Design a protein around this ligand. Structure first.
Ligand SMILES: CC(C)[C@@H](NC(=O)[C@H](CS)NC(=O)CCC[C@H](N)C(=O)O)C(=O)O
Ligand SMILES: [Fe+3]
Length: 330
C-alpha cells in the first residue's frame, strides 16, 4: 500500500515569449506529452519573481486582523456583503477550518465596466484592505495579476500549438478587458493541536485538506511554497506531485477537457493534509463571459466533435457552485 510519485516534467517555456517558431513547437511537444500523461508540468524560465510573490503574500496573511477579515469577507461569512460571491476574504474557523484565503478578480472590473453595470454573474469589483494598514499590497497584487496574465497568455500559445492550432487559438479569448481569471492567495497554517474537523479522510485512507476535484478553468497556473501536498489520480491510484517553489505547476481545467473531447484531460487531484505553514497561490485562467470555443477531437482525422459549444460564463458559474457543493465552502 505504498504511494508512487508522479512524473512532472520541467518545461522551459521561455521560447513561448519569443519568435523562434521551431523552438516554440518543441515546447508545444513537451506540453502535449505532459497533457496526455498525468497532466501536470512545471513551467520553468517563466520570468516572474516568485520570491517577491511569496514574501508579499506572507506579509499580508500574517498581518491582517480578524476585524479586517470581517470587513473583506465574502457573502458566505458576512451576510452584509451580498455582492461578494467570488472576491474577498475566506475566513478560517479556529478549531474547525484551518485554510483561509483572499481572492481577487480582473482589476479592470470597476463600476464603469459594462459587465458591472449590467450586473452579469461572476463579475465583481475587487475589495481591498486599508492601504495604510497594508502599504503596497494592492499595488503588488494588481501588478502580479498582470504578471501572471502575461505568463498565462504565453502558456496558452504553447497549448494551442500542441493541439495543432495556430498559436492564438486560446489566447485570442484571453483578454485584459473581460477575463474572468482570478488569483487566490491561500494560507495553509501550522497548527498544534491541528483541528481534527479540518482533516478529511479519503476512501483510500489518506488524510486530506481538500478532496479530489477537477479544476474549474481553461488552465491553472499555480505557485506553491516548498511543502509537498498535491496528489494526482491515475488508473493505478494517487501519485505524489513533487513541490518546486521556483516554478509554476501547470494543469488543464475541465473547460480544456470539454473542448478537446477529453484528449487533454483535466487531471483529478487532491490536497494531502500536512501540518506545515505554507502557501498555495493559484491563478485560474478563465476566458470572457461570452467566450465560446468550438470543441474538436484530436484523435479523429477530420477533428470533428459532436460536443456542443459551451459558453464560458455558464461553465464558470455552474462549475464554481458545483465545486463548493461537492468539496465544501473554502
Ligand atoms: C492548489 C489548489 C488545489 C488549492 N485549491 C483551490 O484553489 C481550489 C481547487 S482548484 N479552487 C477553488 O476552490 C476555486 C476558487 C475560485 C475562486 N474563488 C474564484 O472565484 O475564481 C489548494 O491548495 O487548496
Ligand atoms: Fe485544483
Amino acid at each position: 500500500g505504498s504511494v508512487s510519485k508522479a512524473n512532472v516534467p520541467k518545461i522551459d517555456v521561455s521560447p513561448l515569449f519569443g519568435d523562434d517558431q521551431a523552438a516554440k513547437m518543441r515546447v508545444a511537444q513537451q506540453i502535449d506529452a505532459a497533457s496526455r500523461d498525468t497532466g501536470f508540468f512545471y513551467a520553468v524560465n517563466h520570468g516572474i519573481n516568485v520570491q517577491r510573490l511569496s514574501q508579499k503574500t506572507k506579509e499580508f496573511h500574517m498581518s491582517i486582523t480578524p476585524e479586517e477579515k470581517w470587513d473583506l469577507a465574502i457573502r458566505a461569512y458576512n451576510k452584509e456583503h451580498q455582492d461578494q460571491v467570488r472576491a474577498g476574504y475566506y475566513l478560517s474557523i479556529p478549531g474547525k477550518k484551518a485554510v483561509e484565503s483572499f481572492c481577487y478578480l480582473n482589476p479592470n472590473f470597476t463600476p464603469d465596466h459594462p459587465r458591472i453595470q449590467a450586473k452579469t454573474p461572476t463579475h465583481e469589483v475587487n475589495v481591498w484592505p486599508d492601504e495604510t494598514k497594508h502599504p503596497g499590497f494592492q499595488d503588488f497584487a494588481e501588478q502580479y495579476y498582470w504578471d501572471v496574465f502575461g505568463l498565462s497568455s504565453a502558456l496558452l500559445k504553447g497549448y494551442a500549438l500542441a493541439l495543432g492550432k495556430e498559436e492564438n487559438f486560446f489566447a485570442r479569448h484571453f483578454k485584459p478587458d473581460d477575463t474572468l481569471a482570478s488569483v487566490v492567495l491561500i494560507r495553509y497554517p501550522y497548527l498544534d493541536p491541528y483541528p481534527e474537523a479540518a482533516i478529511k479522510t479519503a476512501a483510500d485512507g489518506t488524510k486530506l485538506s481538500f478532496e479530489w476535484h477537477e479544476d474549474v478553468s481553461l488552465i491553472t497556473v499555480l505557485y506553491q511554497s516548498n511543502v509537498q501536498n498535491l496528489q494526482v489520480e491515475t488508473a493505478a491510484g494517487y501519485q505524489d506531485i513533487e513541490a518546486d517553489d521556483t516554478g509554476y505547476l501547470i494543469a488543464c481545467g475541465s473547460y480544456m477537457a470539454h473542448l478537446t473531447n477529453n484528449y487533454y484531460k483535466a487531471p483529478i487531484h487532491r490536497v494531502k493534509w500536512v501540518n506545515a505553514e505554507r502557501q498555495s497561490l493559484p491563478f485560474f485562467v478563465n476566458l470572457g463571459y461570452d467566450s465560446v470555443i468550438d470543441p474538436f477531437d484530436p484523435r479523429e482525422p477530420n477533428g470533428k466533435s459532436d460536443r456542443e459549444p459551451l459558453s464560458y460564463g455558464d461553465y464558470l458559474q455552474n462549475g464554481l457552485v458545483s465545486l463548493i457543493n461537492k468539496n465544501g465552502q473554502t
